[PDB]
Design a protein around this nucleic acid. Structure first.
Ligand SMILES: [K+]
Ligand SMILES: [K+]
Ligand SMILES: [K+]
Ligand SMILES: [K+]
Ligand SMILES: [K+]
Ligand SMILES: [K+]
Ligand SMILES: [Mg+2]
Ligand SMILES: [Mg+2]
Ligand SMILES: [Mg+2]
Ligand SMILES: [Mg+2]
Ligand SMILES: [Mg+2]
Ligand SMILES: [Mg+2]
Ligand SMILES: [Mg+2]
Ligand SMILES: [Mg+2]
Ligand SMILES: [Mg+2]
Ligand SMILES: [Mg+2]
Ligand SMILES: [Mg+2]
Ligand SMILES: [Mg+2]
Ligand SMILES: [Mg+2]
Ligand SMILES: [Mg+2]
Ligand SMILES: [Mg+2]
Ligand SMILES: [Mg+2]
Ligand SMILES: [Mg+2]
Ligand SMILES: [Zn+2]
Ligand SMILES: [Zn+2]
Lengths: 211, 103, 55, 64, 83
RNA sequence: GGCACCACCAGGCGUGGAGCCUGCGGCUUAAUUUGACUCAACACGGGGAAACUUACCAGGUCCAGACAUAGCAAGGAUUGACAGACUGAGAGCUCUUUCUUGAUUCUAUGGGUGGUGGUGCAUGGCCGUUCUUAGUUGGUUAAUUCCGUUAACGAACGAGACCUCAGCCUGCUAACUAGCUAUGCGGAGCCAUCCCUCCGCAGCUAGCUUCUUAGAGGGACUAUCGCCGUUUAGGCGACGGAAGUUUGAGGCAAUAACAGGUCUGUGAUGCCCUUAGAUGUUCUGGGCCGCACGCGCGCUACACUGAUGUAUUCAACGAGUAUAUAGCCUUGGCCGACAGGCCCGGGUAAUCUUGGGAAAUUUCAUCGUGAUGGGGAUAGAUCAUUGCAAUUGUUGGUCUUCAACGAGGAAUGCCUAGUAAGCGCGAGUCAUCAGCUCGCGUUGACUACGUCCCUGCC
């Protein structure tokens, strides 16, 4: 019954990594962006961030209860010791996973890649990202594979501020000719309130108060 | 009050853990309970080093992953009631609070 | 009796007894801390598991 | 050649080939012992072989 | 495959009771963690109930996750002899 | 024209020569599975394979062939099995035998499914490389770094900034899972006591935070001085300073590429092949270790600046259990020459293992220039441990055996300070096996502060 503090934090990390994988495979076409585990004393509340928050809930919340019971039995929680919520992703344009999946379904249907990638770019920039980049790699038109980059705006690539300012995702499209790769990198703007983007300004950015 | 309470706090982040600890020691010092803490245990550094290549070709380059576990111990003298009344504020995610009653 | 000669070899130990918890491959398996992931799968999920590269 | 597979020996109506209810009257007259094992019921016939009483549902056996 | 009526009704009662099922890819578990049937029979019967649209199947991290569909809640209530 | 110890210079330590370890080729083989071949293959696939892994070989099983269609079928579709035979087999595998079982199946067609099967020259992702270079007139810089010249100016990515670790703080915050100091008591010494010295124990009312920890901050900016420099940008020297070599070391890391590697990481994958006498799966056994030979990374040496046997005493990084009689790390006691065993327990851990009782080093003695008490390959006997299993020696011991090697040709590698080199420890792999990698500390230099001579790049 006694579990080390090391074994426990590794177990929480592995549980998070597995939950998100099964939700990514299950709530795929619901716009699943991410999951926020929150272990409260009574229950381990689990918040799901998605775009179709009526498709994950289901008819009278049947799907969400099915997922809540599957998580309880599979992960071995105490009964009523886990409750899966489902919130709304505030800004879908500023999420690279939401746009990666949107571009996935915009290509599974059959739309031309050069027209859906620029559409994703358009939506991201109207959403407010300081810069966005899309990469499409695979057998796009011919048998030889090539990589088409779709960059617009300002994008940093090196240093620590990358893992604060760059929201990125990597998704496959399972097409008839093979697998198509999608790398979406969205560069966020500095939000003083820390909602739309980082709260810490970029290190090189200097502001001089006017006299 | 009567008994001796050891609250162990663990986390993977320093700021959340420290602000939770500050909340606990502030609540303890408002209700006039003597508080010994926060006492910072040596940080545990969980390290994984693996070959970045998914195969055996190229320069054998190694990425070193680290998980840092930070442990805080707070020692009050009181009754269980005030202890669970204090450790009922919004404990931030990632912080593992653990209350143990001593003699 | 076929059930006593099917999976009849002991799996108490050995590399062919532990598998990746994400893929079931038995090679390059990191058993440290109870991770039970393969090298490739841990390198992919490390951020989710909570391992940060600082050095 | 290809090792052939055991095929279930098929005896037409072995239940008719079991009891001896004849000579008018009313004598079921079993012709093979019913295995003693409790779980094995009374309609569970212990086959007899050239030298053994074998119950098919379990393994109870008797040679002679 | 050949699954006794006892085991079949066993996995079909639990599925209707909860509406969901799970298993690990382990064809020699010899006992499902909940149903007193080995993992092989649960996995194979769930694959049948799925080729019939009687469930939805998602595989993730070496584990199966099955969800009864609306056709499944009909066929199970017909099969289990009771609502 | 520049730059760079993956170039040289001045050197240090090497490798290449020897024995052995390991990887690659070749040969042999039933198979000795295979990918990778200049940098950018060759202790690489975290690839230290007894079984599994395993892809290979010799065999034996099993269906884990959904679903749809058509048949066979309660006068039974089908299933399991005692004994004997068969079998490597206590696989009813098959056969004899005759019970048992009950629409789950079975037979045929489609359709599926699995595949460490092919294709990395179909692909994704990832990774390696070009290149961590600095890229996308001139001076200076680590730098497309700045200055300066100017039909360019102003920007952006990259570089730096940033992040982490380390270095400083007698300031701050705080410690019964860290200590110090004092007090009290006890032990020993001296001789008693006292004092002094060295110890042990106690006190959440003994104080405190120097030492330990870990948070917050501070701190260096080339700041000050001289000189040089267009008197700029910068460089050299000097004081002070913990730090003056953007303080050291990393992490991250542009554009564009390569038919670079990976389909044997992936329930990532298109296509092709196979799919029940299977390239699926499982079980047994073998192989992946095979040995005229070639090559690469290494370990151990060639000794006295040493070996051996005493004495002696300094780290750091990290790791650790399901408690079931007990699983992991093991303390203490006992038995045992060792190997190991037995018995009480602690620890899910700054609490117990562990103040981590590391070695090199130090000290004394022996040896005495002798392949010698250097070296320890090979080999015999034997005893233990891991394991289901140790043979083709898992490993660890005991006694014995005592090879080459006396510093290594032509070549060629790495390295500018707590660095090289030496020394040991921890972790990963792991039931057992570390001559390997990834970390750690201990001891601790020589030489240079340049150049384009070679090699490469621009
Ligand atoms: K040499
Ligand atoms: K190598
Ligand atoms: K590739
Ligand atoms: K691959
Ligand atoms: K393929
Ligand atoms: K793997
Ligand atoms: Mg940088
Ligand atoms: Mg030289
Ligand atoms: Mg040699
Ligand atoms: Mg083998
Ligand atoms: Mg085998
Ligand atoms: Mg196979
Ligand atoms: Mg496969
Ligand atoms: Mg290629
Ligand atoms: Mg201090
Ligand atoms: Mg090629
Ligand atoms: Mg090999
Ligand atoms: Mg000595
Ligand atoms: Mg000699
Ligand atoms: Mg010797
Ligand atoms: Mg071995
Ligand atoms: Mg080891
Ligand atoms: Mg060279
Ligand atoms: Zn894996
Ligand atoms: Zn019977």
């Amino acid at each position: 019954t006694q579990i080390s503090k090391k074994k426990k934090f590794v177990s929480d990390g592995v549980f998070y990594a597995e939950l998100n994988e099964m939700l990514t495979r299950e709530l795929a076409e619901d716009g699943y962006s991410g999951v926020e585990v929150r272990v409260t004393p009574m229950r381990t509340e689990i918040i799901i961030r998605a775009t179709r928050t009526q498709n994950v809930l289901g008819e009278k919340g049947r799907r969400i209860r099915e997922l809540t019971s599957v998580v309880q039995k599979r992960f071995n929680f105490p009964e009523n010791g886990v409750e899966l919520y489902a919130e709304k992703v505030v800004n879908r344009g500023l999420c690279a996973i939401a746009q990666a999946e949107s571009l996935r379904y915009k290509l599974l249907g059959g739309l031309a890649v050069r027209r859906a990638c620029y559409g994703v770019l358009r939506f991201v920039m109207e959403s407010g990202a300081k810069g966005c980049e899309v990469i499409v790699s695979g057998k796009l038109r011919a048998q030889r594979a090539k990589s088409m980059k779709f960059k617009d705006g300002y994008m940093i690539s090196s240093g620590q501020p990358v893992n604060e300012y760059i929201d990125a995702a990597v998704r496959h499209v399972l097409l008839r000719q093979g697998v198509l790769g999608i790398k979406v990198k969205i560069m966020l703007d500095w939000d003083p309130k820390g909602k739309l983007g980082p709260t810490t300004p970029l290190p090189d950015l200097v502001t001089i108060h006017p006299p | 009050v009567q008994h001796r309470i050891r609250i162990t706090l663990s986390s993977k982040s320093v700021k959340n853990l420290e602000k939770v600890c500050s909340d606990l020691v502030k609540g303890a010092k408002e209700k006039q309970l003597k508080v010994k803490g926060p006492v910072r245990m040596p940080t545990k550094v969980l390290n994984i080093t693996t070959r970045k290549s998914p195969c055996g070709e190229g320069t054998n380059t190694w990425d070193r992953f680290e998980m840092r576990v930070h442990k805080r111990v707070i020692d009050l003298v009181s009754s269980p009631d005030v202890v669970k009344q204090i450790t009922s504020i919004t404990i931030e995610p990632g912080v593992e609070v653990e209350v143990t009653i001593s003699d | 009796g076929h059930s006593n000669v099917w999976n009849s070899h002991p799996k108490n130990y050995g590399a062919g007894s532990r598998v990746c918890r994400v893929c079931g491959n038995s090679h390059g398996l990191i058993r440290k801390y109870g991770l039970m992931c393969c090298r490739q799968c841990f390198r992919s999920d490390a951020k989710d598991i909570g391992f940060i590269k600082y050095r | 050649p290809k090792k052939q597979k055991h095929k279930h020996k098929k005896v037409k109506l072995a239940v008719l080939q079991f009891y001896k209810v004849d000579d008018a009257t009313g004598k079921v007259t079993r012709l093979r012992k019913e295995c003693p094992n409790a779980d094995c019921g009374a309609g569970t016939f212990m086959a007899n072989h050239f030298d053994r009483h074998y119950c098919g549902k379990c393994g109870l056996t008797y040679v002679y | 495959m050949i699954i006794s009526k006892k085991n079949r009704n066993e996995i079909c009662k639990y599925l209707f009771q909860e509406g969901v099922l799970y298993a690990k890819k382990d064809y020699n578990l010899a006992k499902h963690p909940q149903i007193d049937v080995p993992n092989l029979q649960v996995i194979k019967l769930m694959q049948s109930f799925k080729s019939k649209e009687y469930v939805r199947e998602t595989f993730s991290w070496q584990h199966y996750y099955w969800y009864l569909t609306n056709d499944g809640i009909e066929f199970l209530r017909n099969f289990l002899n009771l609502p």
